[PDB]
Design a protein around this nucleic acid. Structure first.
Lengths: 86, 86
DNA sequence: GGTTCTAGAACC
DNA sequence: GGTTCTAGAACC
């Protein structure tokens, strides 16, 4: 039995009906959430009760996932990568 | 399935090996703990991990049990009675 | 009231 | 790594 958060993230990134809100990158090295707000109100509520993006991000951190900061100087786009890679 | 606290209290007041530390009054209307300290170190640890008397008392309150204050003016003696009676 | 589910802790 | 236990939440 994997932790509930790991299971939920897995099912949400892989479920085809969440495609437009959260999905793997073509390479699989990261998870893409095109628009934070659409995801927060269309996907989060199906997996967590009293869900909020802040919690989601904290949880992801617990599992080694960090926000990709590659925007040079669309703050609604979020991408996550894990500390553990090949 | 009854709450874990209810089960533990039940088993500790009824278990014969805890007799000298915690037991029903002859009438059954209350629970007698002759000496708080002996009980805290001889019984509590068999039922709760990182047990302390303060928690025990709070829990008892959650279930309607209150400390009997019948000492006129042996602060080690504790007796508990429940709000719900005949 | 009693059974089934969802989780994490405990155990092997 | 996988199974079993202990709890409370969910469900009927």
């Amino acid at each position: 039995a994997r932790p509930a958060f790991v299971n939920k993230l897995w099912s949400m990134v892989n479920d085809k009906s969440n495609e437009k809100f959260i999905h793997w990158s073509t390479s699989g090295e990261s998870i893409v959430v095109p628009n934070r707000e659409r995801f927060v109100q269309e996907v989060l509520p199906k997996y967590f009760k009293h869900s909020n993006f802040a919690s989601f991000v904290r949880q992801l951190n617990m599992y080694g996932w960090h926000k990709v900061q590659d925007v040079k100087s669309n703050d609604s786009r979020w991408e996550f990568e894990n500390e553990r890679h090949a």
